[PDB]
Design a protein around this ligand. Structure first.
Ligand SMILES: *[C@@H]1O[C@H](CO)[C@@H](O[C@@H]2O[C@H](CO)[C@@H](O)[C@H](O)[C@H]2NC(C)=O)[C@H](O)[C@H]1NC(C)=O
Ligand SMILES: *[C@@H]1O[C@H](CO)[C@@H](O)[C@H](O)[C@H]1NC(C)=O
Lengths: 176, 56
């Protein structure tokens, strides 16, 4: 997409995550599993719901056609009435199709933005304490248990707490 | 319909406490039955070939 997260550096989606639109997959000594950010999913759901509501009943009064009849010697006004009603119907049909097409583009890019924003949210929290693998995954330089995983997921990762342990591992890897 | 003659019909709306007066000495198609507008509201004349379907 525009932000290059969905079908981008994250090559594919996950069928194992059913409880949310976006989330994480952790794999540590205690096991592996899926989860959700619980924030981006809520913000997206409300944002998508608001968009759908803002399209449904925003037309206020889309032109309601009314049947009118004209005799044999009123062809001009009859053709005028036919053109008028057909004109409004085409205008609103164009508005309906175009709005759906344009907002569909924004909605998918909106989902793309949220994934990249979530990816940046985790990248900026870890900083150098992990290694960016380039496919949407981060490899920790320190031990991260389940509670450590939850800290990353809910935005409360303590960088200095594991900074010294990560520095020892970064030194070892760079030294060979 | 087998007739070369013509019948040209006219109508009017008679408001309350208003009187309609007729005077003719020939070719008069006199009225017998009139219609009271006993309910006004939204309606339409729908041009369709279908008929009743006993539904709501
Ligand atoms: C994010 O999740 C963590 C982990 O659940 C929350 O904090 C810790 O929770 C564990 C047990 O659930 C406690 O033993 C710790 O004392 C909690 N505090 C800390 C500082 O680790 C944390 O509170 C969550 N995020 C927010 C904003 O509250
Ligand atoms: C309605 O019509 C007459 C005049 O056309 C009016 O003077 C009279 O008050 C009304 N008739 C009756 C019967 O009330």
């Amino acid at each position: 997409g525009l932000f290059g997260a969905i079908a981008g550096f994250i090559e594919g989606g996950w069928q194992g995550m059913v409880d949310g639109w976006y989330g994480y997959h952790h794999s540590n000594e205690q096991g592996s599993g899926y989860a959700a950010d619980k924030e981006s999913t809520q913000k997206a759901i409300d944002g998508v719901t608001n968009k759908v509501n803002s399209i449904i009943d925003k037309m206020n009064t889309q032109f309601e056609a009314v049947g009118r009849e004209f005799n044999n010697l009123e062809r001009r006004i009859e053709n005028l009435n036919k053109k008028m009603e057909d004109g409004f119907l085409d205008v609103w049909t164009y508005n309906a199709e175009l709005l759906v097409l344009m907002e569909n583009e924004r909605t998918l890019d909106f989902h793309d933005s949220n994934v990249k924003n979530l990816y940046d949210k985790v990248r900026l929290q870890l900083r150098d304490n992990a290694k960016e693998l380039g496919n949407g995954c981060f490899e920790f330089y320190h031990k991260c248990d389940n509670e450590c995983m939850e800290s990353v997921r809910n935005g409360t990762y303590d960088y200095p707490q594991y900074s010294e342990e990560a520095r020892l591992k970064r030194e070892e890897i760079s030294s060979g | 319909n087998g007739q070369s003659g013509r019948m040209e019909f006219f109508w009017t709306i008679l408001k309350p406490n208003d009187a309609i007066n007729f005077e003719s000495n020939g070719n008069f198609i006199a009225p017998e039955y009139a219609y009271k507008i006993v309910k006004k509201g939204d309606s339409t004349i729908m041009k369709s070939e279908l008929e009743y379907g006993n539904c709501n």
